[PDB]
Amino acid sequence: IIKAFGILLCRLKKYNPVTTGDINKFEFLFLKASYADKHWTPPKGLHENSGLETAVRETLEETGINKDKYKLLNYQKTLKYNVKDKPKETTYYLAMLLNNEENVILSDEHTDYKWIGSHESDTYNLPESLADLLKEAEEFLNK
């Protein structure tokens, strides 16, 4: 079972079109893989040798954002997918930025970053499981 771990990093939206109803004030960091499928995902990476150690290191390497720049919230999820018919699990840990204006620094693994919401799932061509992830995360963040 191949294991990947990432941090689902959220921030507060800088603007809301509507400030009336029950709304989604939050948005998650998504990097666009520079190769192959050009996948959009949260920052993540392969376990080596704690899943959170993995998450924090790969998030650092992938975005330049260290653990001290964000607060790990009490929510997580595991997505199971088969890679070339080999069982894989990716666990994401919700974390919110302390500074809403923290700047993403990409490595050569990605070409683009966007802060998105669960409603933008299809536009970003996210698998139903990552959309589920975003949905649940928003449920948690807005409760």
Author numbering: 5 to 53, 56 to 149
Report text from the authors:
PfAp4AH can asymmetrically hydrolase Ap4A and Ap5A molecules produced by PfKRS (and probably by other Pf aaRSs) to ATP + AMP and ATP + ADP, respectively. PfAp4AH folds into a conventional Nudix domain, with four β-strands (β1, β2, β4 and β5) sandwiched inside two anti-parallel helices (α1 and α3).
We also provide two crystal structures of PfAp4AH - in apo and sulphate-bound forms at atomic resolution. There are four molecules in asymmetric unit for PfAp4AH-apo and designated as A, B, C and D. The atomic resolution structure of PfAp4AH-SO4 has three SO4 ions and a PEG molecule which arise from crystallization buffer. Global structural differences between apo- and SO4- bound PfAp4AH were apparent upon superimposition. Three major variable regions arising from SO4 binding and different space group packing of PfAp4AH were identified in loop regions L2, L3 and L5 and analyzed further. We were able to solve crystal structure of PfAp4AH in two conformations. These two structures were compared and global changes were mapped for understanding the substrate induced changes.
